């Protein structure tokens, strides 16, 4: 029924002749915009793909619950969180990989994992094998349900085009029903299940003696014993006596000194308030009753003297083009991921997470990488929209027209900013290198010499650290996090959170980040703006979005498309995220994390050398890269040897990517001609004519192997170091 | 070769006295040592040494693995050639289908 490769495209089902046919089939498989001209079919295909991907996610969650229920020491960790460690990957005892099973503690053997699965499971209070098995089976059933729904909503009940474009109705349903009621239901689950379970666990009774939430929902006096205010079975909800809920709905705003996590009541009122606000604000768009706001009437009225027509015509382009919506959603999603990474380590939201350094590090850097990738994706798909779905008829003298008109000024000023930032941010490091290398330590940019204090950030820290009890926040009990400032609150034997100090090095590092961010933005925005037409190529739009060049004329026009700009900008995103991760890692080791000492001090992991070492390039190369790799390079013959193996393999793959990045296809095609002549001399020439891969896919392959090598290198380094330090 | 057999090497015995296991059976690595005791081990690193000089008495180290591999590679290569000749212009005149899907 589907044994016809290339059917989805006009120029792919005729019959393979070269391997370029195979590679193009792989590349053009999911490009639905080229397989048809109708929009309804495209929308239906997007719907089906959405359902399939949801099924994939559900399968992944089911597998994780399954493998944490069966092959884990979850119960032993639950009994004593500070003694045992999370564990999974119980490897099969085979030719040589049995050694990877580390001694996680108390007899159990296996690989220590740092994905925070146990923290999530403890957050929901699941403390019974039957509960976990039921959750896994339900997740599998849900995955099958979404897969069948994807089948049904496309092969049997295919919606119509007009249904999709109901932007106001779409927002109202997807914001009320999906989001506000979902948050309300989760808050109900929290208050009715999780909080008593966590209270009992903090009471140190037992991991298996906790009754099933069946009895929690059936009973009322149990939570009355646990919460004094819960004794009002006939709750005064309509009485408006909400002040009688100050036992489980508080505003403490801090860290629990027993588990090192966010106060559960704080999270309760938090998600509850968010649910209420979403339910309130979802009633704003006119769906079918003529009451409420509407898109054009509020968007067309925000004009101005400079911006001419304002946002006139943007509703049509945002409701008739999937790519623009994809770009906006992708950029916002990546920004949200980076925000999550920033705001999660400062306020540990799970019990027994602050002490676990490895999990916090891994989650931080992983979600940062995800955010970077999603932001680059937003920029790319915006470029596709500009090159494909742009319509001069709808856009005239409005936002997009004037953007395209002063694009040259935008690019010029942005490039000047990039150069200025690069000089006055990296020349500082080179200048420090020279001043320290010349034996003149009184000329560096440091605390012992002419210093560049980050005064604005210090002022903001002072303001935010002392906002509790003031006019703006009178009811707040404490500062939102100890990161702004506070005595190190160490639980167990290690610091859970501390005051992240600021100085000249941190100022320079944040300004390096700003430099790299504006540079990557320059690359992406230049690609997006010039993807349609430029002075060099007046008809670049007709060439398409993904073309290798425009010949060797005009002095040479290599790498001119928007795809080429995205390929160039991915490297810069990689560089920026790597620098951010290094900054975070060294800053925490040198200032925040450590083991408490009896004499009032804290035994920091790196002995606090961030102030005098992170200001020179050689300082980094010696005190960080050469010094913190001792654990990874000596991991051989131990339970952490896999990290060293992957370290070597990742250096190798990154060195392999240069093979595709540094070369072209003419030489490879000639060599392949010689090789196919050699095979033909023995009459074993394949029917599919061998052909060297195209230029664009060669660049893509080089980029992919490059990113793989670099990211795996960093990942192995971090994991080996932070696992061996403990 | 100018080496000593692993059986007579004392530090080879010392290294064999402490080793890890591969199969779930406790005596899974020691039997590997008596399997490796037929080779020759130098007195510095104490590890089995594979001879590439093709001696009459040491032909099993490198010659017979080479014969095994060349037989295997020839078998799969001849199988691929036989499939290619039997599924090309001489068979269907459109061998493009015969290479993307196979029996």
């Amino acid at each position: 029924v589907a044994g016809k490769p290339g059917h989805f495209n006009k120029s792919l089902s005729k019959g393979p002749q070269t391997t370029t046919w195979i590679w193009n089939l792989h590349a053009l498989a999911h490009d639905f915009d080229t397989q048809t001209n109708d929009l309804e079919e495209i929308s239906r295909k997007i719907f089906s793909a959405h359902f399939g991907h949801l099924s994939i996610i559900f399968v992944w969650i089911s597998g994780m619950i399954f493998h944490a229920a069966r092959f884990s020491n979850y119960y032993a960790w639950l009994a004593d969180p500070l003694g045992n460690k999370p564990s999974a990957h119980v490897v099969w005892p085979i030719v040589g990989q049995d050694i990877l099973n580390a001694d996680v503690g108390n007899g159990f053997r296996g690989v220590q994992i740092t994905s925070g699965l146990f923290h999530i499971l403890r957050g929901a209070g699941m403390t019974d094998p039957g509960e976990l098995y039921s959750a896994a089976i339900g997740a599998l059933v849900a995955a099958v349900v979404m897969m069948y729904a994807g089948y049904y909503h496309y092969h049997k009940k295919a919606p119509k085009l007009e249904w999709f474009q109901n932007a106001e109705s779409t927002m109202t349903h997807h914001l009320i029903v999906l989001l506000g009621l979902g948050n309300l239901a989760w808050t109900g689950h929290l208050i009715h299940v999780s909080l008593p379970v966590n209270k009992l666990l903090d009471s140190g009774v037992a991991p298996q003696d906790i009754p099933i939430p069946h009895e929690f929902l059936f009973d009322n006096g149990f939570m009355a014993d646990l919460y004094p205010s819960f004794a009002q079975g006939l709750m005064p909800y309509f009485t408006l006596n909400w002040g009688a809920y100050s036992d489980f709905l508080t505003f403490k705003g801090g860290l629990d000194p027993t588990t090192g996590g966010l106060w559960m009541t704080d999270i309760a009122h938090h998600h509850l308030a968010l649910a209420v606000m979403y339910i309130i604000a979802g009633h704003m768009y006119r769906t079918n009753w003529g009451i409420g706001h509407s898109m054009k009437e509020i968007m067309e009225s925000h004009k101005g003297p400079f911006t001419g027509e304002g946002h006139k015509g943007l509703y049509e382009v945002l409701t008739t083009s999937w790519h623009a919506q994809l770009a906006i959603n992708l950029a916002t999603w990546g920004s949200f991921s980076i925000i999550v990474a920033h705001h999660m380590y400062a306020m540990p939201p799970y019990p027994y997470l602050a002490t676990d350094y490895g999990t916090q590090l891994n989650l931080f850097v992983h979600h940062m990488w995800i955010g970077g990738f999603l932001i680059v994706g937003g920029a790319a798909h915006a470029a596709i929209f500009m090159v494909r779905d742009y319509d001069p008829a709808v856009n005239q003298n409005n936002v997009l027209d004037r953007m395209l008109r002063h694009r040259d000024t935008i690019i010029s000023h942005l490039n000047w900013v990039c150069i200025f930032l690069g000089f006055h941010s990296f020349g500082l490091y080179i200048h420090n290198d020279n001043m320290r290398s010349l034996g003149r330590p009184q000329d560096m940019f440091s605390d012992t010499a002419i210093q560049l204090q980050p005064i604005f950030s210090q002022w903001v820290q002072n303001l935010q650290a002392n906002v509790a009890g003031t006019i703006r926040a009178p009811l707040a009990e404490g500062a939102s996090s100890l990161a702004w400032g506070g005595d190190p609150l160490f639980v167990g034997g290690k610091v859970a959170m501390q005051h992240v100090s600021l100085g000249t090095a941190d100022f320079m590092i944040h300004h390096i980040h700003a430099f790299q961010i504006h540079v990557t933005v320059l690359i992406l925005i230049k690609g997006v703006l010039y993807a349609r037409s430029s002075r060099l190529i007046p008809d670049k739009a007709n060439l398409g979005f993904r073309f290798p060049c425009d010949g060797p004329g005009r002095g040479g026009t290599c790498q001119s498309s928007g795809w080429d700009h995205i390929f160039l900008g991915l490297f810069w995103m990689y560089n920026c995220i790597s620098i951010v991760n290094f900054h975070f890692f060294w800053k925490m080791q040198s200032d925040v994390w450590g083991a408490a000492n009896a004499n009032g001090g804290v035994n920091y992991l790196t002995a606090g050398n961030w102030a005098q070492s992170s200001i020179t390039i050689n300082g980094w190369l010696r005190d960080f890269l050469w010094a913190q790799s001792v654990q990874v390079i000596n991991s051989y013959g131990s339970a952490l040897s896999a990290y060293g193996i992957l370290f070597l393999g990742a250096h190798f793959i990154w060195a392999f990517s240069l093979m595709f990045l540094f070369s072209g296809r003419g030489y490879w095609q000639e060599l392949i001609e010689s090789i196919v002549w050699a095979h033909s001399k023995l009459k074993i020439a394949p029917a599919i004519q061998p052909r060297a891969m195209s230029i664009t896919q060669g660049r893509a392959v080089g980029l992919g192997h490059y990113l793989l090598g670099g990211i795996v290198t960093s990942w192995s380094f971090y994991l080996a170091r932070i696992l061996a330090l403990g | 070769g100018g080496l000593v057999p692993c059986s007579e090497s004392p530090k080879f015995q010392e290294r064999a006295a402490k080793a890890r296991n591969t199969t779930a059976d406790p005596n899974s690595g020691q039997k590997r040592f008596e399997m490796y005791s037929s080779a020759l081990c130098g007195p510095e690193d104490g590890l089995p040494r594979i001879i590439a000089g093709g001696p009459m008495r040491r032909a099993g180290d490198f010659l017979i693995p080479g014969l095994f591999f060349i037989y295997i590679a020839g078998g799969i290569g001849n199988s691929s050639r036989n499939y290619q000749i039997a599924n090309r212009k001489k068979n269907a005149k459109n061998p493009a289908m015969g290479e993307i899907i196979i029996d």
Binding site: I94, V95 | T23, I101, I102
Partner: peptide
């Protein structure tokens, strides 16, 4: 593609079971 996947699965299973003992 699926035939290649199943063939490589069979051969890698053979290698692993040969190295199992």
């Amino acid at each position: 593609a699926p035939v290649i996947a199943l063939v490589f699965f069979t051969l890698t299973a053979g290698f692993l079971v040969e190295l199992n003992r």
